[PDB]
Design a protein around this ligand. Structure first.
Ligand SMILES: CS(=O)(=O)Nc1ccc(C(=O)NCc2ccc(Cl)cc2Cl)cc1
Ligand SMILES: CS(=O)(=O)Nc1ccc(C(=O)NCc2ccc(Cl)cc2Cl)cc1
Ligand SMILES: CCCCCCCCCCCCCCCC
Ligand SMILES: CCCCCCCCCCCCCCCC
Ligand SMILES: CCCCCCCCCCCCCCCC
Ligand SMILES: CCCCCCCCCCCCCCCC
Ligand SMILES: CCCCCCCCCCCCCCCC
Ligand SMILES: CCCCCCCCCCCCCCCC
Ligand SMILES: CCCCCCCCCCCCCCCC
Ligand SMILES: CCCCCCCCCCCCCCCC
Ligand SMILES: CCCCCCCCCCCCCCCC
Ligand SMILES: CCCCCCCCCCCCCCCC
Ligand SMILES: CCCCCCCCCCCCCCCC
Ligand SMILES: CCCCCCCCCCCCCCCC
Ligand SMILES: CCCCCCCCCC
Ligand SMILES: [K+]
Ligand SMILES: [K+]
Ligand SMILES: [K+]
Ligand SMILES: [K+]
Ligand SMILES: [K+]
Ligand SMILES: [K+]
Lengths: 276, 282
C-alpha cells in the first residue's frame, strides 16, 4: 500500500498549510490594525505640506512642482553607492540572502552577474556558516560541559535540566548577539533601543527589509566598526539559525501535544454523550 | 578523539573563510566596475537638472529646496504619491497588502517596499517572524517532499523506457538531475518570467532577475510582482502565491545541488593541487 503513506503525507501537509494560511490571516489583521492609523496620519500631513510649500513660497507655480516631483522620483531609482566598500557590502547582502535592497543593480549586466553570483555564493556561504556554527557549538558545548557538572550533583534532577540548559543558551545568546550589538548600534547609528533590536532581528533572520542598515547613513564611522559588524553578522546568523531550529522543535512538540489533547477532548465528549 | 576532529574542523573552516573573503572581494570589484559609470553619468545629469531650476527661480530659499527633497524622501519610505492631479491614493496596509507583507516576513524574502512604522508594529513583527519562520519551514519541507514524490512518479516512468543495453546505475542519475534542472527552470523560472513580463510590463531579463532574487529569498524590493497600481486579474496574485511556495521548495533543492557540486569541485581542486605539487615540472 504505497499510496497510503502519500495520503498521510498530504493530510499532514494540508494541515500545516491551513495553519500557515491562518497565521498569515491573523498577521494581516494585526498589521492592518497597527499600521492603518499612522498611514492615514502621514498621508494627510504630506498633502498638507504640499500646499504649505505652495503658499509659503508663491514663487513656485502649481505646474512646476509636479515636474520637480517627477525628477525626484526619477532620482530615487538611482539613490558613492558603488565605491570600494559599498560593493563589498552589496555582495555580502547577496550571498547571505539578507538583501537590504538599499543598493541594487540597475545595469543589465549587473543583474546578470548578480544572478550568477547569488547562485554560486549562497551555497559557499552556507558552508562557511555551517563551519562557524559548528565551532560556536563546540565552544558552547565546552561551556555546558562546565555548567552541567557544578549543578549536576545536588538539588535538581535530570530530564528537567535540558530546559535549563536551553534557557542559559537563549539568555547568553540574546546578551552577546542581540543586546550588546543593539546597545552599540543605538549609540553609533543613532537608532532607538527598539529600533536597534528590530534591526538585529530582521538582519539575523535574513529578512532584511532595508529600512534600517548599520552603516547606511552618511555618518563618520570608525575603521573597526563595519568589519566588527561583519563578524557579528557571521556569528549571529549561526546563532539565529540555531534559535530558529529550536523554535521549530518546540513547535513540533506542541503540535504532538495538541494532537493528543484533541484526542483527549474527543474521547471525553464521546463517552460523555454515550451516558444516556 | 574530540580534539583532533575539532582541529581538522577549524582548519577546514579557516580555509572556507579565506575562500569566502576572496569571493566577496572579486564580487565587489566586479559590481563596482559594472555599476559605477552609470552612477556617475546619472549624478552629473541630476546636478545639471538641479542647477537648471536652482537659478530659474531665485525667489526660492534654495536651502529649503534640498530640505524639501529630504522630507519627500523621508515620506516616500512608507509609500506616498504626492500629486495634485491625483489626490486620491491606494492603501499599502489594507486587507491584502498586510497579508502580502506577512508573506514576505515568514518567507524571509523581505522586499521591504512596505515596512512597519509603528513601534508596536515592529515588536509584533519580531514576534511574528520568530514564530513564523520555523512554521513556514515545516510547510516548505512538506511541499518539497510532495514535489519530490511527484518527481519520483515521473522518473519511475522515464527510467524504464531508456533502459537499453549497456545501462549503468550511477550514470542515469545524471540524466535525472538534468531533467530535474530543465523541467524546474521551465516551470518555476521560464513560464512565470513570461507571465511577469506580459502582466507586470517587465523585460525578460528583469522578470528572470525578479524570479531569482525572490526564490533565493534575497528580496531586494526593486521588483515586486503585483506592486504597481495597474489592475491585476485578481487571479494573478494567488497564482503568484502558489508559484512562490513551490519555487521556494525547488530553489532550495537546486541550491543544495549547487552546494554538492561545490563540494565535488573543491575535492577535485584539492587533489589537483596535490598532483601539481607531486609533479612540479618533472
Ligand atoms: C550607503 S551604503 O549602504 O551604500 N554604505 C555602506 C553601508 C554598510 C556597510 C557595511 O559593511 N555594514 C556592515 C555589514 C556587513 C555585512 C552585511 Cl551582510 C551587512 C552589514 Cl550592515 C558598507 C557600506
Ligand atoms: C504596493 S504594495 O506592495 O503594497 N502592493 C502589493 C504587491 C504585491 C502583492 C502580492 O500578493 N504579490 C504576490 C506575492 C505573494 C506572496 C509573497 Cl511572499 C510575495 C509576492 Cl510578490 C500584493 C500587494
Ligand atoms: C550589456 C550586456 C551585459 C552582459 C553581462 C556583462 C557582464 C558579464 C559578467 C562577466 C563575468 C566574468 C567572470 C569572471 C570569472 C573569474
Ligand atoms: C557589532 C558589535 C557587536 C560585537 C559582538 C561581539 C560578540 C562577541
Ligand atoms: C519580545 C521583544 C521585546 C522587545 C522590547 C523592546 C524594548 C526596548
Ligand atoms: C573580520 C570580518 C570580515 C572582514 C571584512 C573586511 C572589512 C570590510 C569593512 C572595512 C571597511
Ligand atoms: C496531521 C496533523 C499535523 C499537525 C499540524 C497541526 C498541529 C497543530 C500545531 C499547533 C501550533 C500551535 C502554536 C502556534 C504558534 C502559537
Ligand atoms: C500569532 C498567531 C498565532 C495563532 C495561530 C493559530 C493558533 C491556534 C491553531 C490551532 C490549530 C488546531 C489544529 C489542531 C490539529 C490537531
Ligand atoms: C474575503 C474578505 C474580502 C477580501 C477581498 C480580497 C482579499 C484578497 C485581495 C487580494 C490580495 C492578494 C492576495 C492573494 C489572494 C488571497
Ligand atoms: C538555475 C537557474 C537557471 C535559469 C536559466 C534561465 C534561462 C532563461 C533563458 C531565457 C532566454
Ligand atoms: C505548476 C506551477 C506553475 C506555476 C506558474 C505560476 C505563474 C506565476
Ligand atoms: C532577448 C530575451 C532573452 C535575453 C535575456 C535572457 C537572460 C540572459 C541569460 C540569463 C542568465 C544566464 C543564466 C546563467 C546561469 C549560470
Ligand atoms: C581544508 C579544506 C579546503 C577546501 C576549501 C575549498 C577548496 C576549493 C575552493 C574553490 C572552489 C569553490 C569555488 C569554485 C568557483 C568556481
Ligand atoms: C565568480 C567568482 C569566482 C571566484 C573563484 C575563486 C577562485 C579561487 C579558488 C581558490 C583556490 C584555492 C585552492 C586551495 C587548495 C588547498
Ligand atoms: C486538512 C485535511 C486533512 C485531514 C486530516 C486532519 C483532519 C482535519 C484537521 C483540520
Ligand atoms: K537561508
Ligand atoms: K531577504
Ligand atoms: K529589501
Ligand atoms: K532570506
Ligand atoms: K530582503
Ligand atoms: K526597496
Amino acid at each position: 500500500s504505497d499510496s497510503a503513506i502519500n495520503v498521510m503525507k498530504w493530510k499532514t501537509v494540508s494541515t500545516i498549510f491551513l495553519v500557515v494560511v491562518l497565521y498569515l490571516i491573523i498577521g494581516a489583521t494585526v498589521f492592518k490594525a497597527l499600521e492603518q492609523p499612522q498611514e492615514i496620519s502621514q498621508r494627510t500631513t504630506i498633502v498638507i505640506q504640499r500646499e504649505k510649500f505652495l503658499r509659503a513660497h508663491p514663487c513656485v507655480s502649481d505646474q512646476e512642482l509636479d515636474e520637480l516631483i517627477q525628477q525626484i522620483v526619477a532620482a530615487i531609482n538611482a539613490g558613492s553607492h558603488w565605491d570600494l566598500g559599498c560593493s563589498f557590502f552589496f555582495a555580502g547582502t547577496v550571498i547571505t540572502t539578507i538583501g537590504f535592497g538599499n543598493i541594487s543593480p540597475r545595469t543589465e549586466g549587473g543583474k546578470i552577474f548578480c544572478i550568477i553570483y547569488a547562485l554560486l555564493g549562497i551555497p559557499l556561504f552556507g558552508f562557511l556558516l555551517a563551519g562557524v556554527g559548528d565551532q560556536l557549538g563546540t565552544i558552547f558545548g565546552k561551556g555546558i560541559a562546565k555548567v552541567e557538572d557544578t549543578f549536576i550533583k545536588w538539588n535538581v534532577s535530570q530530564t528537567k535540566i535540558r530546559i535549563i540548559s536551553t534557557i542559559i543558551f537563549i539568555l547568553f545568546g540574546c546578551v552577546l548577539f542581540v543586546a550588546l550589538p543593539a546597545v552599540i548600534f543605538k549609540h553609533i547609528e543613532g537608532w532607538s533601543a527598539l529600533d536597534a533590536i528590530y534591526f538585529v532581528v530582521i538582519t539575523l533572520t535574513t529578512i532584511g527589509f532595508g529600512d534600517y542598515v548599520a552603516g547606511g547613513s552618511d555618518i563618520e564611522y570608525l575603521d573597526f566598526y563595519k568589519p566588527v559588524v561583519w563578524f557579528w553578522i557571521l556569528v549571529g546568523l549561526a546563532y539565529f539559525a540555531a534559535v530558529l531550529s529550536m523554535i521549530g522543535d518546540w513547535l513540533r512538540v506542541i503540535a504532538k501535544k495538541t494532537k493528543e489533547a484533541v484526542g483527549e477532548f474527543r474521547a471525553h465528549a464521546a463517552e460523555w454523550t454515550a451516558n444516556v
